[PDB]
Design a protein around this ligand. Structure first.
Ligand SMILES: *[C@@H]1O[C@H](CO)[C@@H](O[C@@H]2O[C@H](CO)[C@@H](O[C@@H]3O[C@H](CO[C@H]4O[C@H](CO)[C@@H](O)[C@H](O)[C@@H]4O)[C@@H](O)[C@H](O[C@H]4O[C@H](CO)[C@@H](O)[C@H](O)[C@@H]4O[C@H]4O[C@H](CO)[C@@H](O)[C@H](O)[C@@H]4O)[C@@H]3O)[C@H](O)[C@H]2NC(C)=O)[C@H](O)[C@H]1NC(C)=O
Ligand SMILES: *[C@@H]1O[C@H](CO)[C@@H](O[C@@H]2O[C@H](CO)[C@@H](O)[C@H](O)[C@H]2NC(C)=O)[C@H](O)[C@H]1NC(C)=O
Ligand SMILES: *[C@@H]1O[C@H](CO)[C@@H](O[C@@H]2O[C@H](CO)[C@@H](O)[C@H](O)[C@H]2NC(C)=O)[C@H](O)[C@H]1NC(C)=O
Ligand SMILES: *[C@@H]1O[C@H](CO)[C@@H](O[C@@H]2O[C@H](CO)[C@@H](O)[C@H](O)[C@H]2NC(C)=O)[C@H](O)[C@H]1NC(C)=O
Ligand SMILES: *[C@@H]1O[C@H](CO)[C@@H](O[C@@H]2O[C@H](CO)[C@@H](O)[C@H](O)[C@H]2NC(C)=O)[C@H](O)[C@H]1NC(C)=O
Ligand SMILES: *[C@@H]1O[C@H](CO)[C@@H](O[C@@H]2O[C@H](CO)[C@@H](O)[C@H](O)[C@H]2NC(C)=O)[C@H](O)[C@H]1NC(C)=O
Ligand SMILES: *[C@@H]1O[C@H](CO)[C@@H](O[C@@H]2O[C@H](CO)[C@@H](O)[C@H](O)[C@H]2NC(C)=O)[C@H](O)[C@H]1NC(C)=O
Ligand SMILES: *[C@@H]1O[C@H](CO)[C@@H](O[C@@H]2O[C@H](CO)[C@@H](O)[C@H](O)[C@H]2NC(C)=O)[C@H](O)[C@H]1NC(C)=O
Ligand SMILES: *[C@@H]1O[C@H](CO)[C@@H](O[C@@H]2O[C@H](CO)[C@@H](O)[C@H](O)[C@H]2NC(C)=O)[C@H](O)[C@H]1NC(C)=O
Ligand SMILES: *[C@@H]1O[C@H](CO)[C@@H](O[C@@H]2O[C@H](CO)[C@@H](O)[C@H](O)[C@H]2NC(C)=O)[C@H](O)[C@H]1NC(C)=O
Ligand SMILES: *[C@@H]1O[C@H](CO)[C@@H](O[C@@H]2O[C@H](CO)[C@@H](O)[C@H](O)[C@H]2NC(C)=O)[C@H](O)[C@H]1NC(C)=O
Ligand SMILES: *[C@@H]1O[C@H](CO)[C@@H](O[C@@H]2O[C@H](CO)[C@@H](O)[C@H](O)[C@H]2NC(C)=O)[C@H](O)[C@H]1NC(C)=O
Ligand SMILES: *[C@@H]1O[C@H](CO[C@@H]2O[C@@H](C)[C@@H](O)[C@@H](O)[C@@H]2O)[C@@H](O)[C@H](O)[C@H]1NC(C)=O
Ligand SMILES: *[C@@H]1O[C@H](CO)[C@@H](O)[C@H](O)[C@H]1NC(C)=O
Ligand SMILES: *[C@@H]1O[C@H](CO)[C@@H](O)[C@H](O)[C@H]1NC(C)=O
Ligand SMILES: *[C@@H]1O[C@H](CO)[C@@H](O)[C@H](O)[C@H]1NC(C)=O
Ligand SMILES: *[C@@H]1O[C@H](CO)[C@@H](O)[C@H](O)[C@H]1NC(C)=O
Ligand SMILES: *[C@@H]1O[C@H](CO)[C@@H](O)[C@H](O)[C@H]1NC(C)=O
Ligand SMILES: *[C@@H]1O[C@H](CO)[C@@H](O)[C@H](O)[C@H]1NC(C)=O
Ligand SMILES: *[C@@H]1O[C@H](CO)[C@@H](O)[C@H](O)[C@H]1NC(C)=O
Ligand SMILES: *[C@@H]1O[C@H](CO)[C@@H](O)[C@H](O)[C@H]1NC(C)=O
Ligand SMILES: *[C@@H]1O[C@H](CO)[C@@H](O)[C@H](O)[C@H]1NC(C)=O
Ligand SMILES: *[C@@H]1O[C@H](CO)[C@@H](O)[C@H](O)[C@H]1NC(C)=O
Ligand SMILES: *[C@@H]1O[C@H](CO)[C@@H](O)[C@H](O)[C@H]1NC(C)=O
Ligand SMILES: *[C@@H]1O[C@H](CO)[C@@H](O)[C@H](O)[C@H]1NC(C)=O
Ligand SMILES: *[C@@H]1O[C@H](CO)[C@@H](O)[C@H](O)[C@H]1NC(C)=O
Lengths: 435, 110, 139, 44, 122, 146
């Protein structure tokens, strides 16, 4: 007897492909505000290696969050009538904050056209450029950009985002606890959607993230040498408290018909600088957990350097809380030396704030963040590190680069596949009947 | 487990002024059907309780107009107006969004 | 200047007739499911996208039921018979009580909680039949 | 650019310059990035 | 409050079971190839979802296999494609592993299934 | 005559012997055949603007799907599902055409039959769908009789 071919349709076979998932939301022009209840089907006897560092969900999610940030700036106020020679002078009135502010006055345009409104505001020295103690200044990006004011009714709060699977595709998920990011699993399962993922935009320290729930996980990418980044998972969340101890009056100046500029009126009382407290006993406990896990991947002495002086977005700790953008100095968290084999106190981090912010490592699209009335106070958990290697010894520095390393730290569990439904097999004496 | 907390422990004795009470939810009780889970009862001391509210701002049949309960998201209230009689009871809410079914804590009425 | 000639069956004309004489007009509704008035004998208008969305929706709903016919044993047919025995907990009504007395849209509001359970059993007995028709061709 | 142009001829042994009477040498007050500063340019 | 009653065949489910027991759950995964859990790029997502489905349905129409899950063709199984026995295929092997075994020989077999339908001459 | 539409011009007796040429270009070679539509998608991913030639590929796909399904539906309502020449029980009414078989099958093309019978096909299609529907009802309760 012979042996014949058959064709089966509906076969549980997937290949690894790339598609476009669709954005849900826990309930605008790009996402869909339906709130799904996902389900999970525990499979059996399948492995399906992942390779986290080559993951297409990180490139898509980086694209969509940039698309959401530009979408909420389209009905907002363009600010090109506010590029004038300013007339700036020092503020004269805990008095260690007057060095970084100015008191700038400038001729403005009004609700009419034939008359000129003379107004004033208090900018920052990080948002001014000398042009040619009273002297003439200019803003940052008249030179290159058209600055757009962020609309005050739109909050900057991270709102969680589900990614769900289209027709013909699936999403896999390793159920196991100690997974290194790459390599095979033993426990996978199919879901309809991801868990809720908060878009926490931060550099150099992962804020409000998930937890290890193990010992401590560290994950470095495996190009020829690992001179690029490495991601610490940090089981116990170190808590940081960040605040700005100064009320702010916000005056609104009418630039044109139906559009107005929210400026900074006055400081009532004290001008004390913005800062962040870090618990020192819990931080030095946390670095002890990290340094023993790094020995299982390097086995040398381990010291922590600081980022060399330069631009603010690449060196300082950038985050957003309360509607304003803190740039905090982390030199007093990252010097140490661990030469092989309870502290009383807290740590003070110097923090500067800016208002003309140019986000997502891009030129041409600056944004004037408006001032916030009141006294900002904010709390957040440190649940991760972004470290970079410079190479006996080996020194580590605070990480930088793209914002996608914030999404390797969330989307490491997931994998999108494509289901090929046709499949052939040798059958038996099953030949097609002759008519 | 989802916990329900109501803050006033008893009711004022005067039958003239209405004093609104409220519950608080430890988690949002909106179910995936598009409906909520917060209830409101009245256990007369010595007798079995009875239904008064089967959904936020929805009133059971044969219930006076004093009993009405508003609430948005996780915040919840119980608006009270025109105190009409001395119908005593024990007030407590309900979490019926998950398991186990957790009630309020009790509130005496006199 | 026109005028009405002779008349024939029309779309949904047997709705609320009965159940046994409304199944003699199955092709009349099955003809109006794919092509509508959208097909007649400069770009990106409001009425242009709303016409194009009505054409993508009309293919997605047609292919949904046409897929579900082929998963069953019933492709290219209008009345087909299965091997799934009827269960009286789904509905207990008599044979002369749903035929000649009931109409559709009254039977629709009766078993609409049980169709997802019924659909699973038709698909399950089609896998079991096609494996057996394979395994009968090994002799 | 739709403004008044202060535009004149070009100030340039015979065949080295032929089409003078097609080009002209215009000059005008153009804007810049800074809203209060004005500048002149000399486009052809 | 939502409980969970009886459990039937889920979506992949039999993805790790053998190819004799995975060929009884073919209807479960064929339902999910078109429906999904779903403004100009809103349409181009849908049209690709339709035309990925119709590409596999036309290919089954080229062959004799239109309107059925298990179909049978009269192409002989060449013993150099894979030489494994019938019990170590249908009882000791999954579909994800068989897919990697004959992934080289896929375009050869499809070319023969199509040719033997033009050689009907009926 | 082999080649796409090559029998256009021959009489319809000999133009109907090679119907496989048309029902393969119109079933296989339409959606399954082309894979180069998803080679132009990434080239549309490189440019960040929706172009004019991206709109016309929607309208040439939705016309290609609808033209395929509105000829398979109409062959599905009838009993002629996966075949090319099928017979029906509808008797030919001589008020549709009084013309003899030797004039039709041997001195008239298919393209001369389009321009004669086209006013009548909406009436003819009603009688094929009605007789197919009467047939499947009759072979159901006959089936249930034994
Ligand atoms: C990491 O994760 C933590 C945990 O969530 C997160 O901390 C929280 O951040 C949110 C930021 O949205 C904080 O929410 C703010 O809270 C303040 C204070 O609220 C408390 O106090 C009031 C009054 O006592 C109580 O009623 C209240 O229940 C709280 O106890 C609020 O003032 C803020 O509200 C303003 O902003 C909202 C969004 O725009 C508006 O909806 C709201 O109406 C307020 O705006 C109005 O008033 C402003 C003047 O005050 C005015 O300028 C506006 O124009 C408008 O008129 C806001 O709700 C929350 O408290 C934080 N929780 C803790 C424990 O810290 C971190 O932010 C996060 N970190 C990172 C980096 O992601
Ligand atoms: C704007 O700049 C001008 C000079 O560029 C300032 O004008 C004078 O500054 C001197 C410096 O002490 C004063 O004594 C004069 O009274 C100023 N004259 C006028 C008309 O203002 C001016 O003070 C600057 N404006 C501000 C708000 O600092
Ligand atoms: C705002 O506009 C006023 C008026 O154009 C400017 O005042 C001029 O200042 C210069 C510098 O001393 C004087 O020479 C002029 O005589 C002033 N003009 C008038 C009408 O008094 C003022 O400098 C502008 N300020 C800014 C910041 O642009
Ligand atoms: C910035 O400078 C302006 C002008 O020099 C200050 O405005 C003065 O405010 C005082 C107090 O209300 C008034 O008495 C003056 O008449 C104001 N001057 C003008 C020209 O309006 C403003 O207070 C300064 N801001 C800060 C924070 O010091
Ligand atoms: C950071 O903020 C937390 C609050 O979120 C502080 O925790 C409080 O610590 C005091 C100790 O004096 C306790 O009395 C409070 O009960 C704590 N509150 C909570 C909510 O736990 C913490 O001390 C702050 N740390 C630093 C370094 O500022
Ligand atoms: C804030 O960061 C800066 C550098 O980014 C730190 O400045 C250095 O401070 C040390 C202290 O002895 C000096 O020796 C260096 O020369 C400084 N750097 C430069 C470029 O001059 C600063 O110390 C940080 N703040 C705190 C509180 O540590
Ligand atoms: C590390 O950072 C600290 C401060 O952030 C630098 O200053 C030292 O601060 C400690 C505080 O207890 C003092 O005991 C040391 O004496 C300080 N150092 C010196 C040289 O005076 C410190 O310089 C940084 N570097 C090192 C290698 O510790
Ligand atoms: C960390 O933050 C706390 C409060 O947010 C600050 O604590 C205050 O410290 C001063 C003296 O340093 C005391 O007089 C206050 O009474 C404290 N506040 C409270 C509520 O007790 C602390 O100074 C911050 N750490 C810094 C700036 O290094
Ligand atoms: C703009 O036009 C004016 C005349 O309307 C020019 O003014 C004179 O032009 C002649 C020709 O070169 C010069 O000799 C004079 O010196 C100019 N007058 C003055 C007061 O300078 C003027 O030159 C034109 N502008 C330019 C740039 O050519
Ligand atoms: C560019 O602007 C300047 C502004 O000063 C113009 O120069 C003035 O022109 C008027 C009208 O001809 C004269 O009355 C003034 O004497 C000029 N001022 C100076 C300082 O020369 C100039 O004409 C403008 N150029 C153009 C092409 O419009
Ligand atoms: C996963 O693999 C295990 C391997 O033991 C499968 O369990 C056995 O499957 C064979 C198949 O006929 C049975 O004969 C055995 O009795 C099973 N063993 C037990 C202990 O039940 C298991 O079925 C596989 N998973 C799935 C979903 O099929
Ligand atoms: C079965 O598969 C074998 C693969 O080994 C085929 O034999 C070879 O086919 C290739 C491609 O046509 C030729 O280049 C080789 O020359 C063939 N080998 C030999 C030894 O001739 C074989 O043709 C296939 N078919 C059958 C019916 O055996
Ligand atoms: C943008 O600005 C850069 C920095 O120079 C600053 O601006 C110039 C105009 C002067 O005022 C100088 O004193 C300032 O420090 C320039 O190097 C650059 O050329 C400017 N233009 C562009 C297009 O980048
Ligand atoms: C994590 O475990 C897998 C499983 O063996 C292994 O392949 C991989 O190399 C491990 N990664 C690290 C960083 O240890
Ligand atoms: C993280 O923050 C939340 C909210 O303040 C808090 O409940 C939790 O305990 C924090 N995690 C750690 C490890 O402190
Ligand atoms: C800040 O200014 C407001 C404005 O009147 C005042 O009420 C408040 O007391 C000030 N101080 C704070 C918030 O510490
Ligand atoms: C590697 O680590 C061990 C301890 O685990 C240590 O004894 C050894 O010296 C290290 N290797 C080198 C080359 O230092
Ligand atoms: C409408 O009902 C009457 C009796 O109720 C019946 O005779 C008639 O046939 C029905 N009409 C149709 C179109 O079925
Ligand atoms: C269903 O029909 C049967 C008739 O055999 C009857 O005995 C039974 O009571 C009916 N059940 C209900 C719920 O009406
Ligand atoms: C048929 O159903 C109708 C319900 O509209 C009912 O009135 C009528 O009595 C039924 N026929 C018989 C014979 O019971
Ligand atoms: C099947 O082929 C493989 C490689 O061609 C060979 O190793 C194996 O021995 C063959 N099987 C038998 C039973 O000979
Ligand atoms: C086939 O089954 C035997 C046990 O009968 C087992 O030892 C072997 O591993 C199986 N083959 C494969 C490829 O796993
Ligand atoms: C498929 O062919 C490749 C060469 O293209 C070869 O390396 C591989 O081993 C083949 N697959 C199997 C399962 O032998
Ligand atoms: C074309 O016409 C000529 C002349 O009548 C005839 O001989 C030939 O067979 C025709 N060819 C076709 C394909 O109809
Ligand atoms: C139609 O054909 C019949 C014979 O088949 C003939 O008697 C009749 O005259 C024809 N009709 C006309 C209008 O000539
Ligand atoms: C039959 O064919 C010949 C030539 O092919 C043509 O001249 C004649 O007109 C045809 N008959 C009719 C009735 O048209």
């Amino acid at each position: 007897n012979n042996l014949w071919v058959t064709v089966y349709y509906g076969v549980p076979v997937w290949r690894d492909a790339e598609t476009t998932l669709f954005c849900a939301s826990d309930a605008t022009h790009a996402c869909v505000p339906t709130d799904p209840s996902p389900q999970e089907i525990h499979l059996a006897n399948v492995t399906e290696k992942f390779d986290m560092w080559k993951n297409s969900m990180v490139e898509q999610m980086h694209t969509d969050i940039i698309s959401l940030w530009d979408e909420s700036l389209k009905p907002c106020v363009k600010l090109t009538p506010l590029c004038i020679t300013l007339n700036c002078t020092n503020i004269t009135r805990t008095e260690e904050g007057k060095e970084e502010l100015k008191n700038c006055s400038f001729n403005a345009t009004t609700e009419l056209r034939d008359k000129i409104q003379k107004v004033h505001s208090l900018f920052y020295r990080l948002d001014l450029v000398e042009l040619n103690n009273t002297s003439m200044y200019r803003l940052i990006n008249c030179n290159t950009s058209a600055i757009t004011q962020a609309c005050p009714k739109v909050s900057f709060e991270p709102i969680p985002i589900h990614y769900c699977a289209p027709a013909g595709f699936a999403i896999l998920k390793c159920r196991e606890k100690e997974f290194n990011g790459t390599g095979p699993c033993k426990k996978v399962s199919t879901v309809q959607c991801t868990h809720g993922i908060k878009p926490v935009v931060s550099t150099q320290l992962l804020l409000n993230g998930s937890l290890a729930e193990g010992k401590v996980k560290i994950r470095c990418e495996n190009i020829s040498n690992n001179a690029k980044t490495i991601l610490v998972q940090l089981t116990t969340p170190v808590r940081i408290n960040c605040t700005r101890p100064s009320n702010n009056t916000r005056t609104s100046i009418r630039i044109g018909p139906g559009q107005s500029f929210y400026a900074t009126g006055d400081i009532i009382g004290d001008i004390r600088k913005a800062y962040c407290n870090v618990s020192e006993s819990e931080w030095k406990e946390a670095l002890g957990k990290v340094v023993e896990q790094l020995r299982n991947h390097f086995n040398k002495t381990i010291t922590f350097a600081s980022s060399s002086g330069g631009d603010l977005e690449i060196t300082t700790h950038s985050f957003n809380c309360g509607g304003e953008f803190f740039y905090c100095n982390t030199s007093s968290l990252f010097n140490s030396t661990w030469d092989g084999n309870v502290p009383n106190g807290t740590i003070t981090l110097p923090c500067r704030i800016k208002q003309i912010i140019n986000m997502w490592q891009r030129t041409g699209q600056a944004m004037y963040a408006p001032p916030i009335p009141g006294k900002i106070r904010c709390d957040s958990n440190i649940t991760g590190l972004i470290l970079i290697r410079d190479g006996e010894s080996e020194t580590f520095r605070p990480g930088g680069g793209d914002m996608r390393n914030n999404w390797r730290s969330e989307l490491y569990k997931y994998k999108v596949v494509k289901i090929d439904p046709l499949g052939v097999a040798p059958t038996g004496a099953k030949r097609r009947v002759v008519e | 487990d989802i916990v329900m907390t109501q803050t006033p422990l008893s009711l004022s004795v005067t039958p003239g002024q209405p004093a609104s009470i409220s519950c608080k939810s430890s988690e949002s009780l909106r179910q995936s059907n598009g409906k909520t889970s917060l209830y409101w009862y009245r256990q007369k001391p010595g007798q079995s309780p009875q239904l008064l509210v089967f959904e936020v701002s929805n009133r059971f049949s044969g219930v006076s107009d004093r009993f009405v309960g508003s609430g948005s998201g996780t915040d919840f209230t119980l608006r009270i107006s025109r105190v009409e009689a001395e119908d005593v009871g024990f007030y407590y809410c309900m979490q019926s969004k998950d398991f186990p079914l957790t009630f309020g804590g009790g509130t005496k009425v006199d | 200047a026109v005028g009405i000639g002779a008349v024939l069956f029309g779309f949904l004309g047997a709705a609320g007739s009965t159940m046994g004489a409304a199944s003699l007009t199955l092709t009349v509704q099955a003809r109006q499911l794919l092509s509508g008035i959208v097909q007649q004998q400069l770009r990106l208008t409001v009425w242009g996208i709303k016409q194009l969305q009505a054409r993508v929706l009309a293919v997605e709903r047609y292919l949904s039921d046409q897929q579900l016919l082929g998963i069953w044993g019933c492709s290219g047919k209008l009345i087909c018979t299965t091997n799934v025995p009827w269960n009286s907990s789904w509905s207990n009504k008599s044979q002369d009580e749903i035929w000649n007395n009931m109409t559709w849209l009254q039977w629709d509001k009766e078993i609409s909680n049980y169709t997802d359970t019924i659909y699973y059993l038709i698909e399950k007995s089609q896998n079991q039949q096609e494996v057996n028709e394979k395994d009968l061709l090994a002799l | 650019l739709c403004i008044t142009l202060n535009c004149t001829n070009i100030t340039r042994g015979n065949l080295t310059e032929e089409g003078k009477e097609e080009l002209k040498n215009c000059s005008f007050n153009a804007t810049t990035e800074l809203r209060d500063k004005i500048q002149k340019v000399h486009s052809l």
